[PDB]
Nucleic acid binder design. Structure first.
Lengths: 227, 367, 137
RNA sequence: GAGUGGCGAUGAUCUGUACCCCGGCGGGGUGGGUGUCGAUGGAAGUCUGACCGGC
RNA sequence: CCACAGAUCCCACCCGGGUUGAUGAACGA
């Protein structure tokens, strides 16, 4: 075993007993895991294994995400926080300094987000509809990163709307494009092109466009800067 | 023209430039804020906002939310709303800071402590104790054993023969606690705890013919401190079990029907919560605990554990080794169903679950 | 006897730490802010033991521990604005059982240190002179 | 003429074939790793010696 | 250019170390 820093803050790689390499983050709440993930001690510091097949962010990193706008003390608005898988990893990355505002409108699932957010002062859970940022206007502040992973046909438009409410000028947006929940009929690759155009025809500056394959079928993530 | 803001922080009035014209800070009370936020959804203004619109006397006001407009018109003002206004942004840009400026909190440190707990409570509105309790129970179990092991090693300097004569830790401790020296031991005082005729005699004879050490009252009471601690823990344990039973029946009745309060709680503890236990497949539940054994098997392709913390179920650890894997598999399956009826609401159906389980066990045992 | 006593002392030390870590995790369901406000385990335990509910803390009962004017105020304000859970008296006394055990064990420890000092000076005075009773034992 | 008792997701199979043994099965032993602890058990098993400084 | 200083260095005594340890030597009630 060996753990070492990567190009990105608070994000580490492991050499393993057998010779495999897996992403991990620095455990903000030591001894405690959110999903089933492996906990790993190295030189008396504990790390949480970051499975790429579950977390789209881990996926995007392993597909060569140039520069990750999520780091120490960053303020993120997380649309579609779900059960807390990925958001728990951005909590680890951001540390006590920074803040994550998790919006999620499915009660069945916010149920399990609660447990994650109790243990973690970083994360501020919100049971609300990302289509109405007015309904959480009064709890959140403006942010550096708008991380948007919501299953909705007009997902992009939702994201832009939240952006002009909460995203700082020159802030970054990681937008996950779910081809099959925008339209199962259309070609995933035609969808990626037309959604990016919505960002450009607003004023987002497309930095990088990753295809999440192996890890997520019919998915692409866009990194862009709001002006 | 006054641009009005509503936030957890209170009610703030801005001019068109983005300068705080006047503010009224909210009370730092979880109860009242949550309610006012729930109320704001239906268009009801904060009570802090009502006071603020009086102190300033503005002709044209503009709010954030379109549901508020008709409410403030009914209150006497000419009102409109701007969605993602420059002002509303200007406010949130300085929101880490302006919490301190309007004296909502002394520092940033416990603005975020409060806001975290507001968010927690605000979504709660839209099992942990069971877990903690069993975890402490397990600590107490562990400690009883550590101390009893110590006590026997220690007290045996004086009365070595007593160790193999009293199997039971609680009993052993009661003797050292009540007596100390072995020459203080009496038919009368020993009957007064229910030791049987024949055993009292073997104890007293062993104390008479003891090859132990003669030792001061200072030495004995040192030992007796441990004995009394052991006795204290046993009582605390029994109290914790009853408490645990109370909560466990309340929080997860079907699970508790299956494996008892303690083991039920113990599974919750490992899973993290009831809803987490509910989301699990049986094949996970079957191995919880036993992680070292599992990942050893998964890394190498070796033989996996048949059972984790589930080993504690009487039907498993008492049964012969070739029956255990089947019993475990059947239990876990039922537990998964039990956890799920417990999680996604209400109904007690633990009787048929037990009945189905005992059917499966009776079959396993007839081979 | 010197050996047994120090061994039992190292058991108690270990237990005090285990219970105190448990208690803080436990009592923090009700009053989470108190955890980082009280460094000392014995003090923490005394609070959970003497008061119970967070809303039962009082100034003079706290002045009695040794708490300086300023700290009493920080604790009380922390309890007022607490984002902890509202909880039954059954739940609190459950936690309080551990608190009282912690406190007991601290007395037993100090008692064992004195007993140990006595034996250690008797049985190995030169060693005791160098490293103290405990470390000598 | 009245009530019961009736495959099935609300769930069968696959592998811990352990070895082979005596009478698919009973019993047997040898096995695996795993829970306990132990023993006393087994570990270059227990540093170094020429000059150290102050002047 | 010498003179004289300087401080260092030893250098050896001198003292103390020191025959009741000089040395260096990687932690875990």
């Amino acid at each position: 075993i060996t753990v070492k820093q990567t190009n990105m803050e608070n994000i580490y790689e492991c050499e393993f007993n057998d010779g495999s390499f897996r992403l991990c983050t620095r455990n903000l709440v030591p001894n405690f895991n959110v999903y089933g993930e492996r906990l790993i001690k190295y030189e008396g510091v504990e790390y949480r294994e970051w499975n790429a097949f579950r977390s789209k962010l881990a996926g995007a990193i392993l597909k060569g995400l140039k520069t990750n706008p999520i780091r120490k003390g960053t303020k993120v608005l997380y649309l579609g926080a779900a059960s807390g898988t990925t958001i728990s990893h951005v909590s680890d990355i951001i540390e006590l300094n920074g803040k994550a505002y998790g919006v999620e409108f499915s009660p069945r699932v916010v149920r399990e987000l609660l447990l994650v957010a109790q243990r973690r002062p970083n994360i501020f859970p919100l049971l609300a509809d990302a289509r109405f940022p007015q309904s959480y206007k009064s709890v959140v502040e403006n942010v550096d990163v708008l991380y948007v992973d919501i299953a909705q046909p007009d997902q992009t438009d939702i994201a832009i709307y939240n952006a002009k409410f909460f995203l700082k000028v020159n802030g970054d947006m990681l937008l996950v494009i779910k081809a099959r929940s925008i339209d199962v009929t259309k070609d995933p690759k035609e969808i990626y092109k037309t959604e990016v155009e919505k960002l450009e025809n607003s004023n987002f500056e497309t930095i990088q466009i990753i295809n999440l394959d192996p890890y997520d079928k019919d998915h692409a993530i866009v990194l862009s800067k709001y002006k | 023209k006054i641009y009005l803001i509503e936030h957890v922080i209170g009610a703030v009035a801005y001019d068109e430039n983005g300068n705080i014209v006047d503010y009224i800070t909210n009370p730092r009370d979880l109860g009242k804020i949550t309610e006012e936020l729930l109320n704001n959804e239906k268009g009801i203004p904060f009570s802090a906002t009502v006071e603020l619109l009086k102190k300033v006397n503005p002709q044209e006001v503009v709010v954030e939310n379109e549901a508020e407009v008709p409410k403030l018109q009914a209150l006497g003002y000419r009102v409109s709303y701007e969605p993602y206004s420059k002002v509303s942004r200007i406010f949130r840009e300085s929101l880490p800071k302006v919490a301190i400026d309007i004296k909502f909190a002394s520092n940033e440190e416990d603005y975020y402590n409060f806001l975290h707990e507001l968010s927690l409570e605000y979504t709660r509105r839209k099992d942990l104790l069971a877990i903690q309790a069993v975890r402490a129970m397990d600590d107490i179990d562990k400690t009883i054993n550590l101390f009893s092991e110590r006590l026997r090693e220690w007290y045996s300097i004086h009365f070595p023969e007593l160790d193999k004569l009293i199997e039971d830790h609680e009993e052993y401790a009661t003797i050292v606690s009540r007596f100390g020296d072995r020459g203080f031991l009496t038919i009368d005082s020993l009957k007064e705890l229910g030791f049987n005729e024949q055993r009292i005699n073997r104890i007293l004879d062993a104390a008479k013919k003891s090859i132990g050490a003669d030792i001061s009252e200072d030495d004995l009471s040192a030992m007796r401190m441990i004995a009394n601690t052991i006795l204290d823990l046993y009582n605390i344990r029994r109290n914790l079990n009853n408490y645990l039973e109370g909560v466990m029946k309340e929080v997860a009745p079907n699970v508790t029907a299956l494996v008892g309060p303690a083991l039920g709680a113990r599974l919750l503890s490992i899973a993290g919560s009831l809803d987490e236990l509910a989301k699990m497949p049986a094949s996970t539940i079957q191995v919880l605990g036993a992680e070292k054994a599992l990942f050893r098997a998964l890394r190498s392709g070796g033989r996996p554990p048949k059972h984790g913390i589930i080993f504690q179920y009487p039907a498993i650890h008492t049964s012969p080794r070739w029956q255990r894997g089947k019993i475990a598999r059947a239990l876990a399956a039922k537990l998964a169903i039990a956890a799920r009826v417990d999680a996604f609401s209400g109904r007690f159906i633990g009787d048929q679950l037990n009945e189905q389980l005992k059917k499966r066990i009776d079959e396993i045992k007839e081979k």
